[PDB]
Amino acid sequence: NLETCYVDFLELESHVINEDYLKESVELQKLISTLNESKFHLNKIGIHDFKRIRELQISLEDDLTVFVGDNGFGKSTILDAIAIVLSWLRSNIEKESKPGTYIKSHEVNNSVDVEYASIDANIKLKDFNTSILITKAKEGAYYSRNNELLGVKKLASIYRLVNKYVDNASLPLMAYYSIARSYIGGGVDRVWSKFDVYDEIEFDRNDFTDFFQWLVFLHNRASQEKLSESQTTINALFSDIQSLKATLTQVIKGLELSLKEKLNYMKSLQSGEHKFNNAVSLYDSVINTILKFLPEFQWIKLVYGDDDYKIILKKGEVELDIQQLSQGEKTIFTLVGDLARRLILLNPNLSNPLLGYGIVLIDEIDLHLHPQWQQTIIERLTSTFPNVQFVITTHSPQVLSTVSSRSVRILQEVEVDGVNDLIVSHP
Amino acid sequence: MWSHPQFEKINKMNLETCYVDFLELESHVINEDYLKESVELQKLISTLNESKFHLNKIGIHDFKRIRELQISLEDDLTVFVGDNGFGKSTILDAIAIVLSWLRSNIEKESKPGTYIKSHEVNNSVDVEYASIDANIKLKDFNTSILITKAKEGAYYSRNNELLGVKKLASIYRLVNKYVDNASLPLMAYYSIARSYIGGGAKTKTVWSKFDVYDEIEFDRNDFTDFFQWLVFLHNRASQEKLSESQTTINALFSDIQSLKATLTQLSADSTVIKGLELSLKEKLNYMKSLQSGEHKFNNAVSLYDSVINTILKFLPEFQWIKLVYGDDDYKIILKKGEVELDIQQLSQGEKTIFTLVGDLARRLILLNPNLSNPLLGYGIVLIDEIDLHLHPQWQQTIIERLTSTFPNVQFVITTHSPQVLSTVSSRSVRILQEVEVDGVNDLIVSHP
Amino acid sequence: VFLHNRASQEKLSESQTTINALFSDIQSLKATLTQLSAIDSTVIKGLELSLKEKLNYMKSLQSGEHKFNNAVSLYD
Ligand SMILES: Nc1ncnc2c1ncn2[C@@H]1O[C@H](COP(=O)(O)OP(=O)(O)OP(=O)(O)O)[C@@H](O)[C@H]1O
Ligand SMILES: Nc1ncnc2c1ncn2[C@@H]1O[C@H](COP(=O)(O)OP(=O)(O)OP(=O)(O)O)[C@@H](O)[C@H]1O
């Protein structure tokens, strides 16, 4: 069991003062094997007196669940509640006792009778189980209750311990694409640490400008690896650092930072992993991944001119820049590129990086799409990212026409005891 | 825009001939009192009022994806249907570009408008320039306008033709000079950026019809101004609810109550029942005579109720809207079912309808002060992707409600879903298609 | 503050060797700029501005050789 492995690793660490002895311990390797075998999953969540919802218990499937409903049926509230729960888990994982987002005053029900709001959730890791309760009382109400975070902190501890000894340890992906992805994130008119991608980046999506620099760096590394001719690249970077230091001897903080960057470049060149999933292979996989969703186009290239880089796409017989695409292809290009970027950054050890685990929440999947695209997007996403759990809300009947019976959830309003209540039913 | 010696030509009733006749008359008489009573001014006013504003036809050459194309638009409603990448938005931007020069020349003459962006020219090798042209018909008066731009790197020049717009705008400025509350046409554009216009300083005290003419598009601060305008209307009603109107309220009701109780009482010169009835009749006659303007609390209470009921027409699930004055600040309270809701707590779909209808009502009221019912004003409205954040139940009735509420406004709408297409007449449907002709791909428009 | 500090040099009656030292510093800055141009735009801009200021100060020293109103006279 996970608890048995954790206890064994703790005892071995306590007994083995030497770091090498702890690294060679069979308990740590077994724990890593159990963690890799386990798949992230969220079995259920209970909502009490949150927004319109008064009392609800929901169970989610492992692969995909889709909620269909009209306007005003609480589809967005479910997504907000799940993002609320995931916020505390992320904060605890990132650093010790990090405070998380709380329930706002206006979130509680407007009914006079209700006095407090509570959200409960349960997370299952293969055989392990954990739960978390977050609660906030109404304004001007006494007998305040305090949230319980022991279960989540016990999940964060095993991840921090596992990642402390192994620098290639994977992490679960937590992302939440709200409606805000359509304003300017879809548009383009506006060393990298893997820790910043997951822990230091919130679930909401705002700007994709970083994606461009990341692609530029990936292309530069791929070009250097493919063209070779680097010779002593580490020595060349060290000589550049020495030249910078000599110039400094012959703004000061920036120069020192640039010298440290040159030393980091020399160390990176000296390392030279040259793994099977090299830069050229990742570049090809990313481009072919995006091109899979846009059958009309032919190829995508990064053209360098005027001391800058620009993206060139070929459609039919006309080459277009990034800013000349329509809104529809802008949305898909932005969302898919952001999906792949986090998977690559979070899983640098797997041979095929598009196999990590995680949970994704998407709202209004049918924004700016014609029915022909709307009839094949779900299967495309499921095939592209197999080991990821998706939660999607939609109301277009075209989307519903291609979904299995067991994965749908229909919300209804029923008057019981003279009070309107929300119910969830399966076909 | 010239005085001219009024060349006789042949007899006609064109609006332009009346404009020249008035200009010729003005150059001689100096007393403004005689000018304000001249028959020529009356003829010009009548001709301008009878004419109905509507665009006629449009053509596009080498602009964005479209290579060569010409469309004719209906006078009441037209809908464009197509998939992604067929230039549904391009047509709307072309119309906005053309209309901007007309907007600019009304505020002040010889003022530039919107040009063509350098990246909007077609990307083909053999292209050299792009052009957009359009025609506006005022019943029997025809104007045309051309906008063009040459591709960067070429060494051959092109110019714009702005005689028609300058001449047409001069008529509007001239009539506005001699009329206290002359109306103006309505022009608006609701792009795809309106989703977070409602989705997301020095206090204003003076309003004017030119405030809506600053920009042709709807975005950001316009929403804020709507809130500041709404509270201004509410206080205007409250001021008129007090004063002498309350005096007639007290006298007429009490006297009527005095009669009613006696009839109900049937207690026992015939007392003073006849005198009381005579006093009630005199009070009612005085109250009826005291009415002025719209005769229903002037035009303030009726305007506020008209706006509220117009908004409530699109949201049947709600009961009433009220403007509670919070101690810190004002706030608006709705009511859905048995619950009281705040505007920040509304769903995305209801927010979009709230902003769209409120903005249209504000613009129409501001531009048409003399009309008894301001909603009848003429103009042109452009809307993109009417099916945003709306479930199919609401998709089937939005079009007829929009047309019925504003009957004299020309609508141009682009859609994406077949639910709307189920409730549109064949006459007002245009379908975009892609056809490769002579080895070159091109776009066509086909009637159903 | 700047005027008082400049008048301090006049009070000290510094000779032309100070101008030579400033010229040497300017030459060293120019060499550093040349090294920077080879294999930091803000640093280049700051170095260019400092070089221009040093050249202006050297021209002020030349005008001092040509003589001008003393900073002491302006101060009082
Ligand atoms: N505090 C509250 N008390 C009672 N009802 C509320 C409260 N807050 C919101 N509501 C109700 O929630 C309804 C839906 O708003 P909400 O923000 O939950 O959107 P939604 O139904 O989840 O979204 P979507 O239409 O995108 O699916 C509103 O019609 C409103 O009456
Ligand atoms: N300079 C250009 N040269 C060639 N094609 C261009 C150029 N600029 C834009 N396009 C074309 O414009 C198309 C998009 O046009 P547009 O945005 O009007 O269509 P749409 O998808 O119907 O609109 P919307 O989704 O914004 O309502 C792209 O497919 C692109 O090929």
Q: What does the model show?
A:
The structure is cut from a larger assembly and holds three copies of chain A. Chain A has 427 residues and is of the alpha/beta class. Chain A has 14 helices and 13 strands. The first copy, chain A, has helices spanning 2-15, 19-24, 26-37, 75-94, 150-165, 194-198, 209-227, 233-249, 252-271, 279-293, 327-346, 371-374, 377-384, 397-400; strands at 40-50, 53-59, 64-68, 116-125, 128-137, 173-177, 297-305, 308-315, 318-320, 358-363, 389-394, 408-416, 419-425. In chain A, helix 1 runs antiparallel to helix 3, helix 7 (209-227) crosses helix 10 and helix 10 (279-293) runs antiparallel to helix 11. Chain A is globular, with a radius of gyration of 25 Å. The A-C interface holds A 240, 243, 246-247, 250-251, 254-255, 258 and C 28, 31-32, 35-36, 38-40, 42-43, 46-47. One adenosine-5'-triphosphate (ATP) sits between chains B (64-65, 84-90, 122-123, 384) and A (315, 318, 320, 324, 326-328).
Query: Can you write the helix and strand succession of chain A as a string?
Result: HHHEEEHEEHEHHHHHEEEHEHHEHEE
Question: Compounds present?
Answer: adenosine-5'-triphosphate
Report the strand count of chain A: 13
**Portion in helices of chain A:** 40-55%
Share of residues in strands of chain A = 15-25%
Distance between the termini of chain A: 37 Å
- Estimated structural class of chain A: alpha/beta
Protein name (chain B): AAA family ATPase
Keywords (chain B): ATP-binding, Nucleotide-binding
PDB class: transferase/dna/rna
Keywords: Retron, IA, Immune, Transferase-DNA-RNA complex
